[PDB]
Amino acid sequence: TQIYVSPQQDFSDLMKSWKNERCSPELLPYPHQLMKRLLNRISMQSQLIENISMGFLDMQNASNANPPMPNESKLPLLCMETELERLKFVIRSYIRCRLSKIDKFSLYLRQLNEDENSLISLTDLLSKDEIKYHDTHSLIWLKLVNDSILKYMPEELQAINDTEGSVNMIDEPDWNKFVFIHVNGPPDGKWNEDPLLQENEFGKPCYTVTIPDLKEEVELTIGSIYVMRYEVIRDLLRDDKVALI
Amino acid sequence: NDDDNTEIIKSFKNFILEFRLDSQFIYRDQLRNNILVKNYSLTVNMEHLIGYNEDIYKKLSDEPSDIIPLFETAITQVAKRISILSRAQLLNSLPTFQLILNSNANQIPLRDLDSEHVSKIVRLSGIIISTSVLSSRATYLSIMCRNCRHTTSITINNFNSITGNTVSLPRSCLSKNCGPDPYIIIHESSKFIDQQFLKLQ
Amino acid sequence: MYYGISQFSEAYNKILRNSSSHSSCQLVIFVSCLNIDALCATKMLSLLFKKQLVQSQIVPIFGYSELRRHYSQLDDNINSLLLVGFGGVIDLEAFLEIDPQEYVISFRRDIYVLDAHRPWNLDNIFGSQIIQCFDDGTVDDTLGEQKEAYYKLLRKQRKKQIHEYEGVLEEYYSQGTTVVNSISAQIYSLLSAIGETNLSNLWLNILGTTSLDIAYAQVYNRLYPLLQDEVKRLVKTPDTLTLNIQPDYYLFLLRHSSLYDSFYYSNYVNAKLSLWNENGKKRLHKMFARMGIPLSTAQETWLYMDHSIKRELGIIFDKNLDRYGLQDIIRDGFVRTLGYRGSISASEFVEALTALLEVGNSAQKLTNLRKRWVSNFWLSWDALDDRKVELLNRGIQLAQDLQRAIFNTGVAILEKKLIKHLRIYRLCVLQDGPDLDLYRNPLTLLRLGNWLIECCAESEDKQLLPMVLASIDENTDTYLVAGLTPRYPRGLDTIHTKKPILNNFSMAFQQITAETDAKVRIDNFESSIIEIRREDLSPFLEKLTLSGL
Amino acid sequence: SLPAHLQQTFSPEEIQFIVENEPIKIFPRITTRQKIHTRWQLITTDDKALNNMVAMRSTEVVLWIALLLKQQSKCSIVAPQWLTTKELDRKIQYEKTHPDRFSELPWNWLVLARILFNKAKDDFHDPIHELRGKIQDLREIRQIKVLKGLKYLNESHLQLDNLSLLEINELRPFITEIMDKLREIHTASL
Amino acid sequence: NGLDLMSSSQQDTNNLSHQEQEYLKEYCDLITDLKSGDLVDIDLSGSLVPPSDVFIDVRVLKDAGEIQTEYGVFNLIKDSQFFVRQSDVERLIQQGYLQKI
Ligand SMILES: [Zn+2]
């Protein structure tokens, strides 16, 4: 993102990213700017509500005075606080899901990070606190496994990053997992300016994808829910062409 | 004659389709779960029937053997309604559904049964001493003739309410100059159920 | 009076102005446990204050010691306190050492006490601004003379005025404890004045008013027409709610047990026909034979009992019950129907509630018993909602069991003739027997005493004497003694009902305790129930015999 | 979050939350039009509707705000068009006449229904029980059609044009696992 | 909440190996550090059930004294029922001091 149409757009983007991450079998990149705006918004809203609450408290407790009218007073602050609680819950769920995913795929992401030929970097995928979490957790687990078990095996197989012999130890994500998608179409209101979409009988603009394993082509129209594998659908999901349910 | 049977069947269908407490139609979901596991039977609690309407309970208590088949065919009508799509018009291997009742009335000892309990619903307890080997009973019989040599089908229920209850063979043929009962039974293409005898002490 | 009936709303408004807050609990309610009317009023208030989103807390208490301890526990943040079901008869300021100048600023706190007992503390009315109550229409008319003396008592020949004031105060005091109105009735009057009445409120008011039928039939008869008029003012689809005035009878769980068991366990018929010996059973079988109901038919459940005689039961009773003097059993009651679950009546509902209160789930075991009683109160409160019926069927079966046990004990008492007739009052002590551990509950003891009082009143004796009943709990080695007032037969005219029989037992007990060093513990909210020692009972009793009642 | 396998699918509570995060129409009982007062000034909802409001007029608010006002006496939720007998009749006729197509129906199906029947009970013009029975009948018909359609499970893809959220959620794990098993069997065979 | 709840779950945790116990302590340290960064204003170890209602009825389960809250105080009398805000008692409910949500 570069600019905001409205904070509601940021809320919608956050929810869409959360839904995409929850069902994705692969660790997706990190939307820094969205949460950069959101945290500041939360801070300023909390400051405002606390300020007005403290002001009313001082007014009510300096003397008897007049108690605040229940009309247009309790309901607004109730709405702000419940909305803030809901937003915090959503952010918490998103962060915890990301933590679980980086827990599962620690060795694989560490392996890809040290590869110079790979264009993807760990910095884009992970926030700084997530980097610290990954490295410290990996070191602690390595210390535990070395003290407990690896101290006794011979030198030939002491490394837990072995990719030789019978069975490998690195868990790549399942890119062929079947997922439920909704073809959102182009995010633009014109929804007819993409260079990819074509047409069939009775109009019905659609996108044509192919499966190399089955040597087949599948037509994906706008407004139809499909159950389709994940390996070839990464680009459409990234371009916000389709939304995972 | 037939209108009263249709009215009673409609009343039972309305009861089964309408009975809900809070936010659940219990009997319809019971039918769904029963059909999904190939158990074509339904259990009716008597208190629910009493609470819904008293006239149906009165009629059931008056003449049980006549009334029950109407209910047990209303059940299969509702099952075919809520399980099979008409598709603007097949297997249809759904027999007549079995009705099972439960109640919490006062028990009656075996020695207290007398001439006043004839053709009435009773509840009692005892001990099982022997079980007979199972036997077959016809439900849908294919009947073939000899002289005129045509086909007919006979539908028979298991409730009798009387000693005879049996239409053995129609007198005269269905309309030349055949015998009194010139019919036979085609054992193939026939439907049979199972029956068992028990001794209580 | 402090708060008249017309002023209630104003006080209510004050509560809001002192309790409506965003994140602060500023209202605490103390309820009189082991009382149906208090439970009904608490439920109605809870619904009312849930409507306007006013945060609150409910705390049940059992004894005055608990009341004082919990009041000490409270913080100054709680602006408003409710005390429902008790507290009228004593001065709270002396009990709670309330300094008016500590709570002046005026109205640092507010304590709304709402009680039904007609005799109460006059100083609590005319002395203190901090303590405030809702009058039922008694101070304005009855107390017109005492207030003059109190105001005047708040040159050598002026001692006549002091003597007259002292005499007036003494005359106002020395009066037995009675109840003349219902808390639920007062709350429903407030709701009618405000404009929030509905069917749930009407049902709770009906329960609260019918919980007094056993002991305060005069109050019940005074209050019935208002309920009738209000219920008049306010296809069987699965969501219909029907409140109808159907005929009913003084019978024990008629619509949930067999008719035979109902006639057998009904207290009024027991008293009128002497069912404790064999002649009563013979007369009951005569009743059934002359009515024409078969015995095996009448011993069946009400659901499966024959429809024809169910329809003709009213005519059968009207034609058969005249000969044997049971024609007073017929009355008019309220019937509630919701959905296809069935029909219930107010009498059956209150019996189930009382039984569920009784049965559910030294100093240390006394505290454990009081905690179990509090837990039973909470369970009975939770059983109120219509979403639970396994918590009401259990109550009904427990009511049947408890009535069976009470009948079994009462027949033994009557046949052994343990009722000793003294010159002033009758006495009975349960030294030994079965299932004595059940009678540690004051309400169970009161039920047993009520049955004994009915049995004694339905006799040819022309002496109205109070009855004293005692029990034993071997683990504690104490006697739980309750004092009971006499009752007139239910089939009597209103001319000989000038005033209900007063209870002087609390006064006698407190006087004897204040003049002798008995090891008693008078802490129950009901002032006529005390705990006494086994070794100390007999001399105490002698004192009660020799003291002016 | 992890909680065992709760990281793969949505819980019904999350479904209810995401559905209730939607706009709805309201007929207010009070007025807080600005004196020509405290600003609502929320961060995830247009406050112009909440601030510029007047009684007995139509306006759009989020569903949870409407429910909160309905808990008080400040609200009167307007029922949607598809919650009436005359629309449900043509709907059920549409499913019965078409034994292959799932009928057009909003994806908030059954959920807005549950919520409205739970809270907004007295504002319906039609009796509640009849609407509930019609909804149950629609549920049964769609269940039968789903069972009929599930009988074939290709390894390449599948299409479900008009399934609601809950219907998709309650079926996701079984379909997903079976299709994954078939796909890996085919992949290992080649 | 990364405290291992030694006040309440197995009591001694002695069925774990010493290496496993030190690993648990290290992970609790990581959990404490994680919410000490840029997410200090969000309780990450809080409830994960979406908020659905604002006011709930709460019944006391264990006896205590009085506990201060923001703008108010709650006295935990044994067997009492509260009508309070949902988001003010979630910490107590998670600890097990309150019941009947
Ligand atoms: Zn022929």
Distance (Å, whole) CA D44 – CA A13: 12
Distance (Å, whole) CA C479 – CA B200: 55
A46 touches E at CB < 8 Å: yes
- In the three-class reduction of DSSP (H, G, I as helix; E, B as strand; rest coil), residue E70 is classed as coil
Q: What phi and psi, each to the nearest 5 degrees, are found at residue C103?
A: -105, 20
- In the three-class reduction of DSSP (H, G, I as helix; E, B as strand; rest coil), residue C293 is classed as coil
Pair type for strands C80-84 and C56-61? unpaired
Cβ(A183)–Cβ(A221) under 8 Å?
yes
User: From the CB of residue C455, how many other CB atoms can be counted at a distance below 10 Å?
Assistant: 20
Distance from CA of B196 to the nearest CA of C (A): 30
The residue among D92, D115, D137, D150 with the most chain B CBs within 10 A of its CB, best to mutate, is D137
Distance (Å, whole) CA C260 – CA C285: 10
Structure tokens at B181: 């009962």
Q: What is the DSSP letter of A150?
A: I
Of A24, A27, A16, give the one whose Cα is nearest residue A179.
Answer: A24
Distance (Å, whole) CA D5 – CA D1: 9
**Environment class of B182 (CB within 10 Å of its CB; exposed 0-12, middle 13-18, buried 19+):** middle
- DSSP letters, C304-320, are TS-HHHHHHHHHHHHHH
The continuous run of DSSP H or E covering D144 comes out as helix D128-149
Cβ(D44)–Cβ(A8) under 8 Å?
yes
Distance (Å, whole) CA C274 – CA C209: 30
D97 touches B at CB < 8 Å: yes
Q: How much helix, strand and coil, in percent to the nearest 5, is found in chain D? A: 45, 5, 45
E20-47 b/e with 16+ CB inside 10 Å = b?
A: eeebeebbeeebeebbeeebeebebbbb
User: From the CB of residue D162, how many other CB atoms can be counted at a distance below 10 Å?
Assistant: 17
C22 touches D at CB < 8 Å: no
- DSSP letters, C323-365, are TTT-GGGEEEEEEEEETTS-EEEHHHHHHHHHHHHHS---HHH
Structure tokens at C417: 């003739």
Residue with tokens 């209103």: C494
Structure tokens at D122: 């007295």
The ranges assigned to domains in chain A are 5-171, 172-244
Of C408, C459, C458, give the one whose Cα is nearest residue C436.
Answer: C408
D90 touches C at CB < 8 Å: no
Which residues of chain E are within 8 Å of residue C25 when distances are taken between CB atoms?
Answer: 72-74, 82, 84
Long-range contacts of C362-366 (CB under 8 A, 24+ apart): C362/C476, C365/C475, C365/C476, C366/C476
Structure tokens at B185: 């039974």
Of A243, A132, A100, A98, give the one whose Cα is nearest residue A179.
Answer: A243
Distance (Å, whole) CA C36 – CA C203: 13
> B182 pairs with which residues across the strands?
none
Q: What is the dihedral of CA C282, C285, C286, C290, to 10 degrees?
A: 180
Distance (Å, whole) CA B135 – CA B197: 9
Please give the CATH architecture assigned to the domain spanning A5-171: Up-down Bundle (1.20)
Distance (Å, whole) CA E78 – CA E65: 9
Q: What is the dihedral of CA B125, B127, B131, B132, to 10 degrees?
A: -60
User: From the CB of residue A67, how many other CB atoms can be counted at a distance below 10 Å?
Assistant: 15
D17 touches E at CB < 8 Å: yes
Angle, nearest 10°, between helix axes B64-83 and B54-62?
130
Distance (Å, whole) CA C171 – CA C535: 36
Q: What phi and psi, each to the nearest 5 degrees, are found at residue C273?
A: -120, 0
**Environment class of D37 (CB within 10 Å of its CB; exposed 0-12, middle 13-18, buried 19+):** exposed
Residue of C nearest to B48 (CA): C340
**Environment class of C272 (CB within 10 Å of its CB; exposed 0-12, middle 13-18, buried 19+):** buried
Distance (Å, whole) CA C528 – CA C183: 21
Nearest to A77 among C20, C22, C53 (CB): C22
Distance (Å, whole) CA C354 – CA C357: 5
Interface of D with C in 65-84 (CB under 8 A): 71-72
Q: How many domains does chain D have?
A: 1
Distance (Å, whole) CA A113 – CA A23: 24
Q: What is the DSSP letter of C502?
A: P
Structure tokens at B200: 């209580």
| Maximum Cα–Cα distance across chain B | 65
Half-sphere exposure of C165 (CA within 13 A, CB side): 13
Q: What phi and psi, each to the nearest 5 degrees, are found at residue B139?
A: -125, -35
Could you tell me how far CA C426 lies from the centroid of its own chain?
A: 23
D87 touches E at CB < 8 Å: no
Angle, alpha carbons D165-D168-D173 (nearest 5°): 135
Structural domain span for residue E77: 48-101
The secondary structure of D11-75, three-state, reads: CHHHHHHHHHCCEEEECCCCCCCCCCCCCCCCCCCCHHHHHCCCCCCCEEEEHHHHHHHHHCCCC
Could you tell me how far CA A199 lies from the centroid of its own chain?
A: 33
CA distances (Å), origin C464, targets A15, A153, C414, C486, C542: 80, 99, 18, 6, 21
**How many distinct helices (H) and strands (E) make up chain A?**
7, 6
Structure tokens at C237: 């689809």
Distance (Å, whole) CA C306 – CA C298: 9
Cβ(C74)–Cβ(C80) under 8 Å?
no
Distance (Å, whole) CA B44 – CA D73: 43
> C493 pairs with which residues across the strands?
none
D99 touches E at CB < 8 Å: no
Show me where chain D is broken: residue before each gap, C-N > 2.5 A. 36
CA distances (Å), origin B164, targets B63, B156, C214: 17, 13, 61
Cβ–Cβ below 8 Å for B85 and D148: yes
CA distances (Å), origin C427, targets B12, C478, C495, D9, E22: 63, 17, 30, 73, 74
Distance (Å, whole) CA D26 – CA D79: 9
Distance (Å, whole) CA C202 – CA C207: 9
Distance (Å, whole) CA A103 – CA D119: 42
Cβ–Cβ below 8 Å for E38 and A39: yes
User: From the CB of residue D126, how many other CB atoms can be counted at a distance below 10 Å?
Assistant: 14
Residues 6+ apart with CB under 8 A from A21: A28, A94, A97, A98, A101
Residues 6+ apart with CB under 8 A from D122: none
Cβ(C159)–Cβ(C187) under 8 Å?
no
Distance (Å, whole) CA D25 – CA D78: 6
- DSSP letters, C453-495, are HHHHHSSS------EEEEEEETTTTEEEEEEE-----SS--ST
User: From the CB of residue A14, how many other CB atoms can be counted at a distance below 10 Å?
Assistant: 20
- DSSP letters, C154-181, are --GGGHHHHHHHHHHHHHHSS----B-S
User: From the CB of residue B164, how many other CB atoms can be counted at a distance below 10 Å?
Assistant: 8
The secondary structure of chain B, three-state, reads: CHHHHHHHHHHHHHHHHHCCECCECHHHHHHHHHHHCCCCEEEEEHHHHHHHCHHHHHHHHHCHHHHHHHHHHHHHHHHHHHHCCCCCCCCCCCCCCEEEEECCCCCCCHHHCCHHHCCCCCCCCCCEEEECCCEEEEEEEEEEECCCCCEEEEECCCCCCCCCCCCCCCCCCCCCCCCCCCEEEEEEEEEEEEECCEEEC
User: From the CB of residue A16, how many other CB atoms can be counted at a distance below 10 Å?
Assistant: 14
Q: Ligand 1 centre and the CA of B1: distance in Å?
A: 29
Residues 6+ apart with CB under 8 A from D126: D84, D85
Neighbours of ion ligand 1 (CB under 5 A): B 148, 173
Q: What is the DSSP letter of C521?
A: B
Sheet-wide strand order for A178-183: A242-244, A178-183, A225-229, D157-160
Of D128, C415, B127, A96, give the one whose Cα is nearest residue E48.
Answer: A96
- In the three-class reduction of DSSP (H, G, I as helix; E, B as strand; rest coil), residue E85 is classed as strand
Cβ(C409)–Cβ(C448) under 8 Å?
yes
- In the three-class reduction of DSSP (H, G, I as helix; E, B as strand; rest coil), residue E58 is classed as strand
List helix spans (H) across C234-292.
Answer: 259-265, 267-273, 278-291
Q: Ligand 1 centre and the CA of B122: distance in Å?
A: 47
Chains D and B touch (3+ CB pairs under 8 A): yes
Of C43, C78, C57, give the one whose Cα is nearest residue E59.
Answer: C57
Half-sphere exposure of B131 (CA within 13 A, CB side): 6
Q: What is the DSSP letter of C439?
A: G
Cβ(C316)–Cβ(C292) under 8 Å?
yes
E53 touches C at CB < 8 Å: no
The residue among E31, E43, E52 with the most chain D CBs within 10 A of its CB, best to mutate, is E52
Cβ(E82)–Cβ(E60) under 8 Å?
yes
Angle, alpha carbons C207-C208-C212 (nearest 5°): 105
Cβ(C287)–Cβ(C263) under 8 Å?
yes
Q: Ligand 1 centre and the CA of B157: distance in Å?
A: 26
Q: How much helix, strand and coil, in percent to the nearest 5, is found in chain C? A: 50, 15, 35
Half-sphere exposure of C102 (CA within 13 A, CB side): 6
> C333 pairs with which residues across the strands?
C246
Of D43, D112, D40, give the one whose Cα is nearest residue A87.
Answer: D43
Distance (Å, whole) CA D69 – CA D30: 10
The secondary structure of C106-139, three-state, reads: CCCCEEEEECCECCCCCHHHHCCCCEEEECCCCC
Structure tokens at A198: 């074509």
Of C188, C105, C134, give the one whose Cα is nearest residue C11.
Answer: C134
Residue of D nearest to A222 (CA): D161
Neighbouring chains to A with at least 3 Cβ pairs closer than 8 Å:
C, D, E
Distance (Å, whole) CA A127 – CA A113: 14
Could you tell me how far CA C387 lies from the centroid of its own chain?
A: 26
The continuous run of DSSP H or E covering A19 comes out as helix A7-23
Cβ(C100)–Cβ(C128) under 8 Å?
yes
Residue with tokens 């915890």: A96
Cβ(B117)–Cβ(B109) under 8 Å?
no
Neighbouring chains to C with at least 3 Cβ pairs closer than 8 Å:
A, B, D, E
The continuous run of DSSP H or E covering C532 comes out as strand C529-533
Cβ(A211)–Cβ(A157) under 8 Å?
no
Q: What is the DSSP letter of D79?
A: P
Cβ(C112)–Cβ(C83) under 8 Å?
yes
> C537 pairs with which residues across the strands?
none
Structural domain span for residue D122: 2-190
User: From the CB of residue B66, how many other CB atoms can be counted at a distance below 10 Å?
Assistant: 15
Distance from CA of C263 to the nearest CA of B (A): 18
Distance (Å, whole) CA B105 – CA C302: 10
Distance (Å, whole) CA C50 – CA C435: 43
> What sign does the CA torsion over B187, B193, B194, B195 have?
negative
Cβ(D62)–Cβ(D22) under 8 Å?
yes
Structure tokens at A13: 């983007």
Amino acid at site D19: V
Cβ(E84)–Cβ(C25) under 8 Å?
yes
Structure tokens at C438: 């059940």
Amino acid at site C255: R
Distance (Å, whole) CA C496 – CA C494: 5
User: From the CB of residue C325, how many other CB atoms can be counted at a distance below 10 Å?
Assistant: 10
Q: What is the DSSP letter of A146?
A: I
Q: What is the DSSP letter of A118?
A: -
Angle, alpha carbons D28-D32-D37 (nearest 5°): 150
Show me where chain B is broken: residue before each gap, C-N > 2.5 A. 89, 175
Cβ(A173)–Cβ(A105) under 8 Å?
yes
Distance from CA of A74 to the nearest CA of C (A): 7
The continuous run of DSSP H or E covering C221 comes out as helix C217-233
